[PDB]
Design a protein around this ligand. Sequence first.
Ligand SMILES: *[C@@H]1O[C@H](CO[C@@H]2O[C@@H](C)[C@@H](O)[C@@H](O)[C@@H]2O)[C@@H](O[C@@H]2O[C@H](CO)[C@@H](O)[C@H](O)[C@H]2NC(C)=O)[C@H](O)[C@H]1NC(C)=O
Ligand SMILES: *[C@@H]1O[C@H](CO)[C@@H](O[C@@H]2O[C@H](CO)[C@@H](O)[C@H](O)[C@H]2NC(C)=O)[C@H](O)[C@H]1NC(C)=O
Ligand SMILES: *[C@@H]1O[C@H](CO)[C@@H](O[C@@H]2O[C@H](CO)[C@@H](O)[C@H](O)[C@H]2NC(C)=O)[C@H](O)[C@H]1NC(C)=O
Ligand SMILES: *[C@@H]1O[C@H](CO)[C@@H](O[C@@H]2O[C@H](CO)[C@@H](O)[C@H](O)[C@H]2NC(C)=O)[C@H](O)[C@H]1NC(C)=O
Ligand SMILES: *[C@@H]1O[C@H](CO)[C@@H](O)[C@H](O)[C@H]1NC(C)=O
Ligand SMILES: *[C@@H]1O[C@H](CO)[C@@H](O)[C@H](O)[C@H]1NC(C)=O
Ligand SMILES: *[C@@H]1O[C@H](CO)[C@@H](O)[C@H](O)[C@H]1NC(C)=O
Ligand SMILES: *[C@@H]1O[C@H](CO)[C@@H](O)[C@H](O)[C@H]1NC(C)=O
Ligand SMILES: *[C@@H]1O[C@H](CO)[C@@H](O)[C@H](O)[C@H]1NC(C)=O
Ligand SMILES: *[C@@H]1O[C@H](CO)[C@@H](O)[C@H](O)[C@H]1NC(C)=O
Ligand SMILES: *[C@@H]1O[C@H](CO)[C@@H](O)[C@H](O)[C@H]1NC(C)=O
Ligand SMILES: *[C@@H]1O[C@H](CO)[C@@H](O)[C@H](O)[C@H]1NC(C)=O
Lengths: 98, 226, 327, 142, 294
Amino acid sequence: FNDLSQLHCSYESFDVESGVYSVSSFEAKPSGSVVEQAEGVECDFSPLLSGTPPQVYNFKRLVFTNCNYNLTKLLSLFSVNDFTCSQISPAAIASNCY
Amino acid sequence: CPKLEFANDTKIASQLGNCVEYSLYGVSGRGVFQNCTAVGVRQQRFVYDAYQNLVGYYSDDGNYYCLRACVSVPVSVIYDKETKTHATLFGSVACEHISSTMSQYSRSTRSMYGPLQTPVGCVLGLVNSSLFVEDCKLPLGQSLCALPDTPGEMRLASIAFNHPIQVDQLNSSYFKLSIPTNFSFGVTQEYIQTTIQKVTVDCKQYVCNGFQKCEQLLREYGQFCS
Amino acid sequence: SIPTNFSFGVTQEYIQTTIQKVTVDCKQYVCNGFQKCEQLLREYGQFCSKINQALHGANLRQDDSVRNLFASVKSSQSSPIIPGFGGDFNLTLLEPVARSAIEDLLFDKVTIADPGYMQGYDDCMQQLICAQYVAGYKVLPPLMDVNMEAAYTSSLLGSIAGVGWTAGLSSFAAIPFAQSIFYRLNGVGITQQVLSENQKLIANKFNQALGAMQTGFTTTNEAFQKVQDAVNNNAQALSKLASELSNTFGAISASIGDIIQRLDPPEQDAQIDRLINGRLTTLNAFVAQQLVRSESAALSAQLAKDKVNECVKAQSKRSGFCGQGTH
Amino acid sequence: RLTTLNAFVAQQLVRSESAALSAQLAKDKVNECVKAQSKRSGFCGQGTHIVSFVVNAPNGLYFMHVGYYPSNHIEVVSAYGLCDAANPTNCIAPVNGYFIKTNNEWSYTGSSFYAPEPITSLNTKYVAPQVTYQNISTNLPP
Amino acid sequence: PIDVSKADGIIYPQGRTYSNITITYQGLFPYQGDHGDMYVYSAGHATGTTPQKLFVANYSQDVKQFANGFVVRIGAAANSTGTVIISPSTSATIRKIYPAFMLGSSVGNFSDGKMGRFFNHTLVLLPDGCGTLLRAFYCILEPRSGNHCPAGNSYTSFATYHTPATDCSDGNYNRNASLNSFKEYFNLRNCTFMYTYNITEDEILEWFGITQTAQGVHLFSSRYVDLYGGNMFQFATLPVYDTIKYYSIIPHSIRSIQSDRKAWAAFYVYKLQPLTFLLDFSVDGYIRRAIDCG
Ligand SMILES: *[C@@H]1O[C@H](CO[C@@H]2O[C@@H](C)[C@@H](O)[C@@H](O)[C@@H]2O)[C@@H](O[C@@H]2O[C@H](CO)[C@@H](O)[C@H](O)[C@H]2NC(C)=O)[C@H](O)[C@H]1NC(C)=O
Ligand SMILES: *[C@@H]1O[C@H](CO)[C@@H](O[C@@H]2O[C@H](CO)[C@@H](O)[C@H](O)[C@H]2NC(C)=O)[C@H](O)[C@H]1NC(C)=O
Ligand SMILES: *[C@@H]1O[C@H](CO)[C@@H](O[C@@H]2O[C@H](CO)[C@@H](O)[C@H](O)[C@H]2NC(C)=O)[C@H](O)[C@H]1NC(C)=O
Ligand SMILES: *[C@@H]1O[C@H](CO)[C@@H](O[C@@H]2O[C@H](CO)[C@@H](O)[C@H](O)[C@H]2NC(C)=O)[C@H](O)[C@H]1NC(C)=O
Ligand SMILES: *[C@@H]1O[C@H](CO)[C@@H](O)[C@H](O)[C@H]1NC(C)=O
Ligand SMILES: *[C@@H]1O[C@H](CO)[C@@H](O)[C@H](O)[C@H]1NC(C)=O
Ligand SMILES: *[C@@H]1O[C@H](CO)[C@@H](O)[C@H](O)[C@H]1NC(C)=O
Ligand SMILES: *[C@@H]1O[C@H](CO)[C@@H](O)[C@H](O)[C@H]1NC(C)=O
Ligand SMILES: *[C@@H]1O[C@H](CO)[C@@H](O)[C@H](O)[C@H]1NC(C)=O
Ligand SMILES: *[C@@H]1O[C@H](CO)[C@@H](O)[C@H](O)[C@H]1NC(C)=O
Ligand SMILES: *[C@@H]1O[C@H](CO)[C@@H](O)[C@H](O)[C@H]1NC(C)=O
Ligand SMILES: *[C@@H]1O[C@H](CO)[C@@H](O)[C@H](O)[C@H]1NC(C)=O
């Protein structure tokens, strides 16, 4: 409820001792958000969607650095039977940057 | 990165000197930007200290901005028993912060200025006065003290210095001496913890409580009880 | 065997009378203000209360020790300090002109950072000591202001010339410093004839001995090294809490927000539990170290009170208790 | 449970070492300023220590020290000792006190009480003459 | 030998620079004081103004494991007077040269049984236009069956020839005639790419480093950033498909005339293995002081 409530539950008693007591500090609210660094062309997923997909022992690798990727452009056309993500959340790939 | 509508209020120069939640294209946090001189290399665009904390960022306009911290203000409380009197303190900060930008649960005061500037910071709930106390029991810090009323808010006093009885020095053959004329017998009570209470513990009884399967699972450890 | 020539030697000693008073905000340090973090922290509960109680007890013990020793060194009666104190005996290094010259020289030559007691929030706002706010703890202000500590030393400097003349603390006999030195030199086993005929050379020797250590404040002084070691000990103790926040203790990240942003709740629960366990173990180790250092500080404060009560207000005859050779 | 017991054992060892050190301190105090009157300034009694009493306490040892406490100080004129004007070689000095100028002349007083009383031979010692002493030629002390 | 205290051949942190701090970094690094794999290039035979038969070393038959990448110091002997390799009695100005690199994962014998054949896709680094261009390709190579050709008769070794009478003129560059000289011996099939890089010609010593990760083959240099200094800095991320196991150096000869035989510099090779270095990042963040742990 207030400071003194936290002070009382810090001792598990309704009677405390007179004294200066350190208590949990407070945080200043953010004033806004900034998102700004160098950007370029969107990431290209065309050769992934074109041609015969190769075998599992001959998997084709695509690297992406300094580009813009939107999962709504390619995962929407993906008839995803199974979606798993290990040591990462499935929704992290849609928003987080690397 | 994903595509995002970049509004005009996203540049660093728009929000200089303000605690903002920065997302530098994958580098997330909250902090304060500031203007500094060019330090480091331009190509890497990210600098860290010895403790892996981001220090600065080279903006796309060619300006270097130090990203330091969204620094908070500590709070302490002075409370007295048998007189329901309490006040709050913000440590080592000028009296600038008011009740607007809040976090945690809540806070409360009494009926109504309210701040007070002290060498320890900014104080809410105290009235200042030119009082001197040699036997302060609520030592606030530096040399400030709170005096509960015996019932308004506590008076703010300075912890005074008991000046010893001054005696003059004569630069001649004579001397000015100080001598007591009256005396008392004072009792001083002292305690010495000469020995703690002798206690022992039964290892298998305490840890096992007399169960057979417990005992079998305890016997692999063995000499720990010994 | 008898000596024929003599010198005044300065021996510099340091006593760590109290460590720096520090406290930590448990939920702020371990949790950094995240809601799911707070919910995963509330099951532990009284651990924050336990460490807060231990740190507050240690701080109150150090505060009581400081108050007790300052009541012990509180002289009953002192003398004013004027320019030209001690006459021919040059002691103006100890003259307060606020602090004194020797104290200001000692504070200047030791690497000391002011912990932002006026505008430390502004120090982190506009322009290593900035980390004591962002990392989620604080350093308590000392019980005395600098200004008052000083008086206390001014009173002690005014009273040393007077108390050390006759046994018994009841009276005060604040003789000028030169005759106090003459009486002490008579008392340590030197005849009054050589004191009566050779005041100038012993005055020059005392002045040279006092002036020698003014430029000696360097690595070669053992007490200066001990002061630097104590300051570095405090710096390392605070640098722990400022440093192993970045330690992960097996987690894949050192940020709670990045963990809850990147991980599924079954696995972010385990990651946050590992982070909480590591931070709490580190905090308990720091609490134990603080208790050990506080007990050592209390014992050293008792030793300092004994030394200032024996061989400061009086001339102790103990062989090298606080001064090598005849003190 | 074993980790808790090991922590308790470590705490017990620390407290036992502290108890041994405090017991040595108590033995020192009861050997110095209980069976005798210690002249150490505030070793076990604030002010001039007079006497001490030792009783038991449910965990330790309780001391009560009766000590001297001054009050109502006064400022007087004092010297270092009396010498003869005709015989500057002979000089006397106060023993456990001071030479105080008090009228109805010079007088002696104690080191802890303002007690003027006429100067005699049972409270002074002979000493070599110096320049700073206070010679006298109208009322020679005995 | 490389002096780590003199800050030679240290790989910079890849994306997180620092300033004015001493920090311990764990990564891929060389040992202090390695003699390395110093190699030298020489000009071919010439009588008057007739460019005669080549004059190369035996490095075509030498192969070493790629391991964790390696660093190469370029032009450490230039801006000085040194002897000519083909003519020991002749002393000329030492000029910097840039080397040719051959990397792969299969090792085999030629038609005459000599070591040096690399099967399947092979990474080739080759300078051209008197070293102004830095062509690179991980492509398929095919031997030729002609005279003095790898699959043909009278075969001894393979090399790349340079003729600065027409290559090193003003402008010109004889349209990438070092690529012509390489294709005079080999054929290019199913080529994956063709990366070109520009470096201005000068007489300043420089550094280069090559390594591989799961992302690909990373090429580091000081020409992009630290011209007057020298440190690794990321310029190339080759998207390789397979792990590189072995590497080798292409021999190179110069078809200079005998009356104008000019001295060429010798380069060095130092292998990289994982260590933990201690680095002093200065106010500019450049590495100038570094010490080892082993
Ligand atoms: C709070 O503390 C003191 C309180 O002293 C007051 O002095 C009068 C002005 C009056 O308001 C009484 O109620 C109090 O006794 C104040 O500090 C004073 O600051 C002014 C301005 O610098 C200075 O002239 C005075 O000398 C200060 N007072 C003393 C005793 O030194 C002030 O009201 C508050 N402190 C600050 C820092 O604002
Ligand atoms: C006592 O010693 C101090 C220290 O040597 C003297 O202070 C110096 O005075 C000179 C002359 O004014 C200055 O040039 C120095 O800078 C002073 N040194 C310091 C450390 O302050 C002082 O003058 C001496 N006093 C007497 C009476 O001899
Ligand atoms: C006490 O009387 C004596 C003799 O008349 C004088 O003091 C002497 O003065 C000389 C000069 O420096 C010293 O060398 C002697 O040691 C002094 N003797 C004593 C006993 O003090 C002077 O008249 C008086 N001295 C005082 C008042 O200090
Ligand atoms: C970089 O770090 C060095 C090392 O601390 C700083 O240089 C020191 O500055 C203090 C300040 O007076 C001097 O007392 C030391 O002698 C200096 N040491 C050295 C080795 O130069 C330097 O200021 C820092 N620079 C920046 C830009 O942060
Ligand atoms: C910020 O600093 C840079 C270089 O230090 C300077 O060029 C620029 O004018 C500064 N801007 C402001 C608003 O102070
Ligand atoms: C101190 O000395 C000065 C100068 O010798 C003198 O004027 C003054 O009277 C002396 N003070 C006393 C109390 O004797
Ligand atoms: C001594 O002081 C006490 C109280 O302080 C007082 O009652 C008593 O009369 C005093 N005695 C003398 C002799 O002044
Ligand atoms: C005492 O020793 C010092 C140096 O050791 C010397 O300068 C001085 O002359 C000596 N004095 C006597 C009286 O021998
Ligand atoms: C006698 O001595 C007392 C005590 O100092 C003093 O108050 C008084 O004035 C003196 N009398 C004379 C005549 O000097
Ligand atoms: C090539 O020459 C070097 C130079 O000494 C030598 O070490 C190496 O064995 C030679 N290799 C062959 C295959 O001749
Ligand atoms: C080159 O590509 C063609 C086109 O499919 C293929 O037939 C041939 O086998 C490839 N050769 C090699 C060596 O990869
Ligand atoms: C290198 O410079 C030449 C000269 O203009 C230019 O034609 C060519 O495109 C450049 N190549 C690269 C990769 O910058």
